[PDB]
C-alpha cells in the first residue's frame, strides 16, 4: 500500500504529520470515514488528509 503525496500539508496539532509533494508514504490505516489517513514517511508517523495522497502501482 504505497502512496505518494499530491500536495504539501503542514502539521497543526492532533498528531498530524507534515508532508511534501512527491514524498512516498506507507498507509497504516484510516479513521471511520476515510477522510484521515495514518501514514509513515521517512520523517515519521502521523495523520494526513486522504485527499492529499494517491496510490502507486498499476
Amino acid at each position: 500500500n504505497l502512496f505518494v503525496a499530491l500536495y504539501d500539508f503542514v502539521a497543526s496539532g492532533d498528531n498530524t504529520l507534515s508532508i511534501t509533494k512527491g514524498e512516498k508514504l506507507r498507509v497504516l490505516g484510516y479513521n471511520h470515514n476515510g477522510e484521515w489517513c495514518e501514514a509513515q514517511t521517512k520523517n515519521g508517523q502521523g495523520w494526513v488528509p486522504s485527499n492529499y495522497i494517491t496510490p502507486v502501482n498499476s
Binding site: D14, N15, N31, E38, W47, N51
Partner: peptide, 10 residues
Amino acid sequence: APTMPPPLPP
C-alpha cells in the same frame, strides 16, 4: 484520529 476536519485540496 484528528477531531478537526481535513482541509480541502488547494
